[PDB]
Design a protein around this ligand. Structure first.
Ligand SMILES: CC(=O)N[C@@H]1[C@@H](O)[C@H](O[C@@H]2O[C@H](CO)[C@@H](O)[C@H](O)[C@H]2NC(C)=O)[C@@H](CO)O[C@H]1O
Ligand SMILES: [Cl-]
Length: 398
């Protein structure tokens, strides 16, 4: 009798990100192509002994939200953006990869109250529509990158329950959750937190690790198969794991990456920790020689430290490389594009996978077919003349 209404939630790296690098220019975004903007990131003043940002170490603001000068400046421009799209909803995202402070902020009644008061303050001062919590990750701590404890799982539920109670009705409360299967199994009580959340952003990307070639494949590749079971991920696999945990599809946004990654398999041996015979590890070996790593290093990508490549840089530096070193291909099973470069032998070497307009449209088709609530994307500053966001808007009828 009537058509569906989908979300398109665009993260924007405005203040800087540990993996994605310095923040970008908010004036370049087309805010008519999205329903929600997650401005990223607020940080958390914390007492973690390994914290290296001294501004977060101010003991008199422990557990409150830190906004850098650029973040404050961008947030003051929101009235201008709203004039271009009066329906736009703007949230502040607190956290991100490597962001400390959540475990301590969630731990006690007193600490949660300080954090919640700070959220309300930031929402009121900048006239925000709500708050997105991007904790990577409760319990696991991103494998020790941030402090964590097993009590984080129950403390996160209490923090969300108490924030939902404190926030004015009509303000939004959302979270991002990881692709790892252990997230719904061990880190986050998805069934217990669902009543408090307007929607949940699934980070269905960053899969190009271990023995897996693809960073954001919708389904598993067969031409370029992942070897170790513990590395075998796809956006669909992640969705099904969250559904099996008890989330309803309409509450979920499928995360879409406006970037690619050079797979770790290209430069580091891949280990299958479930191998019965340890003598058979590593099960994959690097296939980049110094020549290939030097190509990326000259473009500013040091593969010894990171593998993230913005989509607009894929277009300008790889697709349109003057020397024509990269050939684009389509993986019909994975439903995403990828690039190869030629080895000395003339053998094609899998260089990077990413998302193009075709693959974004196919992820929108999945959203519509599976009954998900919408799309989310990381991140708007990495789009190429707003083209991927525009494709999502067209495919979802935004
Ligand atoms: C399937 C899986 O769990 N892959 C892990 C990756 O998620 C992870 O990368 C990190 O993923 C976050 C999203 O969940 C990103 O916010 C973050 O930028 C990214 N970190 C880096 C350095 O790329 C990697 C890193 O530990 O491990 C995989 O196993
Ligand atoms: Cl392309």
């Amino acid at each position: 009798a009537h058509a569906a209404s989908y979300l398109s939630v665009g993260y924007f790296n405005g203040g800087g990100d540990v993996t994605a690098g310095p923040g970008g220019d908010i004036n370049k975004l087309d805010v008519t192509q999205i329903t929600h903007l997650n401005y990223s990131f607020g940080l958390i003043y914390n007492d973690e002994k390994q914290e290296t940002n001294p501004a977060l170490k101010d003991p008199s603001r422990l557990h409150q939200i830190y906004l850098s000068p650029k973040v404050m400046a961008d947030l003051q421009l929101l009235p201008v953006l709203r004039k271009q799209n009066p329906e736009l909803k703007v949230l502040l995202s607190v956290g991100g990869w490597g962001a400390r402070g959540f475990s301590g902020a969630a731990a006690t009644a007193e600490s949660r109250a300080v954090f919640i008061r700070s959220v309300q303050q930031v929402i009121k001062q900048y006239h925000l529509d709500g708050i997105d919590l991007d904790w990577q990750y409760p319990v696991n701590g991103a494998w020790g990158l941030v402090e964590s404890q097993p009590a984080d799982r129950a403390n996160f539920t209490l923090l969300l329950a108490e924030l939902h109670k404190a926030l004015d009705k009509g303000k939004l409360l959302t979270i991002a959750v990881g692709a790892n299967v252990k997230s719904p199994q061990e880190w986050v009580d998805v069934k217990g937190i669902a009543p408090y959340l307007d929607y949940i952003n699934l980070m269905t990307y960053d899969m190009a690790y271990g023995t897996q070639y693809f960073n954001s494949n919708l389904y598993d590749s067969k031409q370029w198969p992942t070897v170790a079971a513990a590395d075998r991920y796809s956006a669909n696999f992640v969705v099904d794991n969250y559904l099996a945990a008890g989330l309803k599809p309409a509450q979920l946004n499928l995360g879409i990456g406006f970037y690619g990654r050079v797979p770790k398999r290209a430069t580091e041996p891949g280990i299958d920790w479930d191998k019965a015979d340890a003598a058979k590890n590593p099960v994959t070996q690097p296939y980049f020689t110094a020549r290939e790593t030097a190509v990326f290093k000259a473009m500013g990508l040091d593969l010894t430290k990171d593998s993230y490549f913005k989509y607009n840089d894929i277009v300008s530096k790889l697709l349109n490389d003057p020397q024509r070193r990269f050939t684009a291909h389509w993986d019909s099973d994975a439903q995403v594009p990828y690039l190869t470069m030629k080895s000395a032998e003339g053998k094609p070497l899998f260089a990077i996978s990413y998302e193009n307009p075709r693959s974004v449209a196919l992820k929108a088709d999945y959203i519509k077919s599976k009954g998900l609530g919408g799309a989310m994307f990381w991140e708007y500053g990495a789009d190429d003349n707003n083209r991927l966001a525009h494709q999502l808007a067209e495919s979802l009828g935004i």
